[PDB]
């Protein structure tokens, strides 16, 4: 299906930006699931900590 000389490269580029940008969203998602790991850890560590004082 005949096309001009530059259209096939505009169509390949408009799906490079999309995969790069959708690649960044993934990186940031994974980071925010690491915050909820730090948070939980902290809480349970403060509980285990108080126990050791009171029983002493």
């Amino acid at each position: 299906m005949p096309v001009l000389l530059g259209i096939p490269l505009l169509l390949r580029f408009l799906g490079f930006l999309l995969v790069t940008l959708f690649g960044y969203l993934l990186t940031f998602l994974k980071k925010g699931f690491g915050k909820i790991a730090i948070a939980i850890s902290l809480f349970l560590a403060l509980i285990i900590g108080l126990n050791s004082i009171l029983v002493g």
């Binding site: 530059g6 390949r12 490079f16 930006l17 790069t20 960044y24 990186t27 940031f28 980071k31 925010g32």
Partner: protein, 49 residues
């Protein structure tokens, strides 16, 4: 004896550039991959404070 197929290849050469796919695709990333290291750095530095 017009060389039909010599005029064509002379219209082309005057209304066409040259472009390397894998060079316009390496610069783009190069600039968007510098702003993504400052977005990460920010996030990382808030969870350490």
């Amino acid at each position: 004896d017009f060389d039909y197929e010599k005029m064509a290849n002379a219209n082309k050469g005057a209304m066409t550039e040259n472009a390397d796919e894998n060079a316009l695709q390496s610069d783009a990333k190069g600039k968007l991959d510098s702003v993504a290291t400052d977005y990460g750095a920010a996030i990382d530095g808030f969870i350490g404070d």
